[PDB]
Symmetry: D2
Subunit: 288 residues, 4 copies
């Protein structure tokens, strides 16, 4: 398959006021990422796409729209994990039939599942689809557990989201050919200093230019320039996080002419006047 | 409004080896709770029912089967919570149409929702279905937030799950006409000492006789008697938790002639010979 | 030798403005507890005593004063734990030589000690003094471990401080002859419903009368009455907590005529005008 | 003014079997660090020196010995924090009188202090001693709280111990002239990539040559090479942690001819045969 290293925006989805998918808006978000953010790929169906608040058919529709819009221009990873393994299988087959390059799957949540159940979960998704897989968990999983998961050759690596840099170094050390995508945009530099292979992030939807610079500069050992860019990026992320992550990134998109729509409920769907004013301010100070 | 105080078993569901619902087996679990455990009602669709691993259609099927088998012999509570509000509303409406007495919904999880989002979530389920509601959250939410939720008159009260007895006392003190259902079977006695109105539990599917005793004796001031029965119950409960909660209760049901079937994947579906043997010893010592 | 069951106030200490011990003030606190609060005993040098911010010599003067003031009128428990085992041994020996009825010692903190190191710590303080010992830890320690500590016959039981009501029933059940003192004043009722033998608490310095009531009514099966007294008590305790525990209890003692002094720095030593006014309102509402 | 940047070993202390300080041994640990590890300085009285298990007189003796042994060959920081603010003041004055370059102090612990209290503790220690200060806390306190601490111009910066690399970047961006010393030896590389000014660590007592290489190689933008040294360091560090941190580093020193003696009880004072064997193996693998 296609190279999966580098910069992947975790695709946001545009919703209408009633919560249905705004396909036109979604296509516009995709074009912005490919054409203007210059990403190496998209991670579709992740937490950033408001995946877990949608139906199975809704997830399928975004997968179809995203593939139809990006075609073969960029690499595409489909996040298909769920507490429902049958639905994870159904989505992984559908993504696979569409041509996604790889699957990703959150470890099953809500219940406290044991390691063997988690490993069976990933092995089943793999077996039923025939696709390669990128694992990840929500608030960890240690070196011994990664070794067991990595006994399946179709597990390519991990979307690392917890801020434990000793565990990140140990994983690269113990499983050096397995890939690591950093999931924390605001800690890209230190992640890249430990050799991650790429990054999957929500802020790359509007700050992809600087994210690629931090990455590439840090890999070149150009730390002082990389750090200046990480500092500006972090002022941007700090405002986005204080203002409302999802709504603020969609408002920033709308200021570039992307109809990024509303958020899906149970999330607050419409930005307040003050959230809107703050997004304009962030745009002015950092994306102008 | 049918009386909702008392002992409610959180209904377990029987699954075939392929993970599909075993309707015969589910009807036998329901008959055992009504006729042998003699519970006041069933809490259908909860975490004990393996609910969050299933599709919307399988959730509806379980609600169909449970209402058909129980008719109006006992009170029925439908748990319809989800990260997907549209699905919660759709499930709330179907359960309301089937004739469930009340609805229950877990606070939306996975994402970190704010309090207003959480209240908007419960207010929407109620307004779209017109039914009463029992709130609850997984791993708190304080007196001020419960008061806000209680501004909606259809919010009857809470299924209390975190072992914070100071908060339990405060909530009963502050809102004396709202109801509380203890969710921790092994802490029934102390909860009943602070005035809870009932209990919703997984172990009542096999230990409903003793659960009622502890509750009734504690409410009456017969503390010595209640505590001896809570001790024996906690010995059983300690063995069920060490042996595997879900499979053990199903193995205990099969020793009573109920086809409780398999667990649903991602959960470990089949009990090991060691787990079957331990269920047989627990049956012999505690439920014979 | 002497009975250790019942109500123990965790002795508060009076300090002057410069942080030195106000002996006259302390003796008055002791007098209020024995004569008005009618406690079965005092737990001296506990965290309520501002113990961990003082020197070894200051800890010794508090143990000399309390024993000289209380004489043989009430049971006395000396808390002598520390991160410094040589200090713990020194205090234990002194308290033993002053005539305290029993010792108590927090598990060594700061560092993460292993179970065996913790058992060796209690065993050493016992070996060096020959006194009975009441264990406790700050924020758990399970049944197995309590059984290991209880192999030493001088370990009488535990001052239970963590809100785990399931562990509390398991402990009492596994070791029916070992004693349990509830450390949480606001959860006295549910603790007494599971058979605890007494309580050690800071609010007994001002609410001693209602505390015995709750306890004695609850061991008597008069749960409706106990619950009411626990409700009023918890209104007082909530107000104490919100206003600042240590200074609020000292302001309340000052309202009875006890020179309870200032708090020792690094805690804020002096109450503000609002704290004093709130103490007065709590005097009027609950202790007049 | 003595430059405080760079590599600081957190000095280990040699104890006799009875727990008293082994002066000869301690001076051999000091000489090894100056002469063999080539550290820029020592951080004396830290948790690595087993400080919190000792008496105030013992702490003072350690300060006297380290300063008499190191003279002015290196920088010296004295950690004098305590839950006892008068003890903190007393220790700070003594260290200042001995010529220590700077003081450092843990946030007071055991109790839950407010921020105002914590700032008052630091201001008092400073005001009473006349010395500069390096703050630190145990397991976070944000940007806004470090700004308030830094209103006191004698607070030089922080010994950063929590693995939050976002906060670390934020701190350096908000107070670019204040210093940061990384406290996690296993994450030196990522910390140096964000511009920390130095590092304080326990493993530099045996791994000082590599620690300096990582630090200096990372500042030079030689990330590939720094990473390889961080990788072997971390295999050593992983083995030290698994085998018992303090005892393994002391056992490692003993194989270098340093009488590092025993640990101080409540910590296990003597290494077992297995711990001795594992230190010899770690010595052969990484430090020969
Ligand atoms: C929890 C979360 O939102 N994580 C983001 C980060 O990009 C995050 O948004 C960003 O670092 C701000 O904290 C991505 O890792 C999530 C991405 O992996 C996804 O599944 O959508
Ligand atoms: C997480 C969990 O298992 N909770 C159980 C308890 O009955 C629990 O099984 C029992 O106390 C054993 O710990 C119920 O509260 C869950 C019940 O409310 C449900 O929603 O299914
Ligand atoms: C941490 C704490 O303050 N606990 C108090 C409680 O009485 C407490 O003050 C009360 O329950 C209010 O929360 C006592 O248990 C402490 C007491 O055992 C002591 O050692 O002084
Ligand atoms: C908690 C702890 O042991 N921290 C060490 C680290 O060097 C640690 O030993 C090392 O990173 C291994 O985890 C030092 O930061 C402690 C040092 O700051 C001290 O105060 O002695």
């Amino acid at each position: 398959m296609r190279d999966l290293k580098g910069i992947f925006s975790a695709l946001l989805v545009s919703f209408n006021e009633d919560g249905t998918i705004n396909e036109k808006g979604l296509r516009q978000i995709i074009r912005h990422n490919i054409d203007k953010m210059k990403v190496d790929g998209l991670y579709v169906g992740g937490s950033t796409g408001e995946n877990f608040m949608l139906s199975t058919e809704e997830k399928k529709e975004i997968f179809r729209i995203a593939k139809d819009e990006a075609k073969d221009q960029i690499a595409l990873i489909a996040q298909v994990g769920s507490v429902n393994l049958k639905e994870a299988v159904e989505l992984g087959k559908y993504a696979t039939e569409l041509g996604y390059d790889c699957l990703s799957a959150v470890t099953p949540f809500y219940y406290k599942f044991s390691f063997p159940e988690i490993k069976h979960y990933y092995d089943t998704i793999i077996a039923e689809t025939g696709s390669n897989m990128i694992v990840y968990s929500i608030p960890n999983m240690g070196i011994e557990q990664f070794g067991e998961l990595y006994k399946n050759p179709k597990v390519l690596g991990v979307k690392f989201t917890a801020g434990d840099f000793y565990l990140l170094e140990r994983l690269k050390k113990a499983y050096p050919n397995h890939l690591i995508w950093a999931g924390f945009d605001e800690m890209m530099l230190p992640a890249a200093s430990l050799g991650v292979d790429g990054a999957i992030g929500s802020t790359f939807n509007v700050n992809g230019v600087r994210a690629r610079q931090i990455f590439e500069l840090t890999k070149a050992g150009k730390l002082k320039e990389a750090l200046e860019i990480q500092h500006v990026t972090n002022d941007l992320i700090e405002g986005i996080l204080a203002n409302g992550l999802y709504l603020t990134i969609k408002e920033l998109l709308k200021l570039e002419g992307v109809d990024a729509g509303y958020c899906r409920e149970p999330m607050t769907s419409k930005a307040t006047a003050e959230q809107v004013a703050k997004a304009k301010d962030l745009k002015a100070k950092f994306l102008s």
